[PDB]
UniProtKB/Swiss-Prot annotation, chain A:
The gene is NKP1. Component of the inner kinetochore constitutive centromere-associated network (CCAN) (also known as central kinetochore CTF19 complex in yeast), which is composed of at least AME1, CHL4, CNN1, CTF3, CTF19, IML3, MCM16, MCM21, MCM22, MHF1, MHF2, MIF2, NKP1, NKP2, OKP1 and WIP1. NKP1 interacts directly with OKP1 and AME1. The keyword Electron transport does not apply. One of its GO terms (cellular component) is kinetochore. It is found in: Nucleus; Chromosome, Centromere, Kinetochore. The keyword Phosphoprotein applies. GO terms for biological process: attachment of spindle microtubules to kinetochore; cell division; meiotic cell cycle. The chain holds residues 2 to 159 of 238 of the full protein. Belongs to the NKP1 family. Component of the kinetochore, a multiprotein complex that assembles on centromeric DNA and attaches chromosomes to spindle microtubules, mediating chromosome segregation and sister chromatid segregation during meiosis and mitosis. Component of the inner kinetochore constitutive centromere-associated network (CCAN), which serves as a structural platform for outer kinetochore assembly. This is Inner kinetochore subunit NKP1.
Curated annotation (Swiss-Prot), chain B:
Component of the heterotetrameric kinetochore subcomplex COMA, which consists of AME1, CTF19, MCM21 and OKP1. The COMA subcomplex is part of a larger constitutive centromere-associated network (CCAN) (also known as central kinetochore CTF19 complex in yeast), which is composed of at least AME1, CHL4, CNN1, CTF3, CTF19, IML3, MCM16, MCM21, MCM22, MHF1, MHF2, MIF2, NKP1, NKP2, OKP1 and WIP1. COMA binds the centromeric nucleosome-binding protein MIF2, and to the outer kinetochore MIND subcomplex, probably via AME1. AME1 interacts directly with OKP1 and an NKP1-NKP2 dimer. Present with 1630 molecules/cell in log phase SD medium. The lineage of its organism: Eukaryota, Fungi, Dikarya, Ascomycota, Saccharomycotina. The chain holds residues 133 to 216 of 324 of the full protein. This is Inner kinetochore subunit AME1. It is found in: Nucleus; Chromosome, Centromere, Kinetochore. It comes from Saccharomyces cerevisiae (strain ATCC 204508 / S288c) (Baker's yeast). Belongs to the CENP-U/AME1 family. It comes from the Eukaryota.
From Swiss-Prot, chain C:
Component of the heterotetrameric kinetochore subcomplex COMA, which consists of AME1, CTF19, MCM21 and OKP1. The COMA subcomplex is part of a larger constitutive centromere-associated network (CCAN) (also known as central kinetochore CTF19 complex in yeast), which is composed of at least AME1, CHL4, CNN1, CTF3, CTF19, IML3, MCM16, MCM21, MCM22, MHF1, MHF2, MIF2, NKP1, NKP2, OKP1 and WIP1. COMA binds the centromeric nucleosome-binding protein MIF2, and to the outer kinetochore MIND subcomplex. OKP1 interacts directly with AME1, with an NKP1-NKP2 dimer, and with CTF19-MCM21. Present with 2688 molecules/cell in log phase SD medium. Belongs to the CENP-Q/OKP1 family. Component of the kinetochore, a multiprotein complex that assembles on centromeric DNA and attaches chromosomes to spindle microtubules, mediating chromosome segregation and sister chromatid segregation during meiosis and mitosis. Component of the inner kinetochore COMA complex, which connects centromere-associated proteins and the outer kinetochore. COMA interacts with other inner kinetochore proteins to form the inner kinetochore constitutive centromere-associated network (CCAN), which serves as a structural platform for outer kinetochore assembly. The chain holds residues 154 to 254 of 406 of the full protein.
Curated annotation (Swiss-Prot), chain D:
The keyword Cell division applies. Component of the kinetochore, a multiprotein complex that assembles on centromeric DNA and attaches chromosomes to spindle microtubules, mediating chromosome segregation and sister chromatid segregation during meiosis and mitosis. Component of the inner kinetochore constitutive centromere-associated network (CCAN), which serves as a structural platform for outer kinetochore assembly. It is found in: Nucleus; Chromosome, Centromere, Kinetochore. Disulfide bonds: none annotated. It comes from the Eukaryota. This is Inner kinetochore subunit NKP2. Keywords: Cell cycle, Cell division, Centromere, Chromosome, Coiled coil, Kinetochore, Meiosis, Mitosis, Nucleus. GO terms for biological process: attachment of spindle microtubules to kinetochore; cell division; chromosome segregation; meiotic cell cycle. One of its GO terms (cellular component) is Mis6-Sim4 complex. The chain holds residues 3 to 102 of 153 of the full protein. Component of the inner kinetochore constitutive centromere-associated network (CCAN) (also known as central kinetochore CTF19 complex in yeast), which is composed of at least AME1, CHL4, CNN1, CTF3, CTF19, IML3, MCM16, MCM21, MCM22, MHF1, MHF2, MIF2, NKP1, NKP2, OKP1 and WIP1. NKP1 interacts directly with OKP1 and AME1. Signal peptide: none annotated. Belongs to the NKP2 family. Its main location: nucleus.
Amino acid sequence: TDTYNSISNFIENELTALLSSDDYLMDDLAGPNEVCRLLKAQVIEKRKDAMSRGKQDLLSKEIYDNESELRASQSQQIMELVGDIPKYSLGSELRNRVEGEPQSTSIERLIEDVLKLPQMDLKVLSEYSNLRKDLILKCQALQI
Amino acid sequence: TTIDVLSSLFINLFENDLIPQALKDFNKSDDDQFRKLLYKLDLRLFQTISDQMTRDLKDILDINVSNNELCYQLKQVLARKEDL
Amino acid sequence: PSKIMIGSILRLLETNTVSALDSVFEKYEKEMNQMTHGDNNEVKRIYSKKERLLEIILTKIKKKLRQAKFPSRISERDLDIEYIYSKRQFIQNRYSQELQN
Amino acid sequence: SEQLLHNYVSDSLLTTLISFQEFKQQLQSYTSDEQQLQHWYELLQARDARVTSELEARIKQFFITLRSRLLRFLESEQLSHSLSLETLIDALYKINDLLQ
């Protein structure tokens, strides 16, 4: 992320460099040479320390805090949405096979894992339930 | 022990000696555009030297103090890292 | 005053002044040409005449700064704006990455 | 925090920093006429706006653009913690083939 660097660059260049050079641009626009030579005096000396690197760093830190809190809330309000089963809620063989080749097989492990599968689009749910019931009957038939 | 003697002396030099040197020459040359030019560019050079060194010395001071300040806040961030 | 101290001030004074001289020349070049007959060569000659005159002034500062009492402890490695500005950028990046981690 | 930047730029305006009577008296020893000064000052207001409106546009787009990249970045990690039930069935089919 490094959004602190982003806001620091934004304030320093897009805002602070822009308006600090806009002081000189207003100078060039007003000229009447002494007009601009004064224009760079009183507003700028009222501007002193409001554009310091210290003040830029302070306000950018405040903006970073605001944005960090806001994105923290945005992450918090999406932690909960899951249109799927979560990980760590399914046996070792399943969490291996679903994402990669298990590198080994064990039928006994498979049956005591598939026996743990819970009850629950609607078509996916239906095929899940039918397939799971068929699998349970298959391992029962084995044992018999 | 002599930092704001140095910067003050430089800043003092520019408004006390440089700025009037070009300004009076710039004012005098109303009859000669080419010489009034050399003095107008000298006056702009001395005005930009004035403002530039003023906020550049402000910048050396501000960068020093803010570097120490940011170092301290970095200590704070590291403390948070350790706690977690 | 130490020769290192006098030089370090001289490096700041000379280097910053020339950076003002070249910057103002190119910034104001639009209103420079119509009355120097549009001759960039004359602009270069005009630069040379003011460079030596500015050097005459700057050397005047040097031969008046050399007798000005100063210590020797202040480092020349830090007496330059660009280096400490690069340090500012470095510490800024450090700050951001540590925060996100 | 769009309003923060809006306040900062509005505060930073030269017209904000100097009132007309203020703007007059620093220039009173220098300029010739109040109304001529007002021309530059109404220019100062009629001018100092169009940067402000320009400044509003860049801060507004700046704050939403970062929100977009943060959101997609946050969303991506959640995809690594959930398992597609369809892929679970893809595995269960071959498990049933093995049992068969």
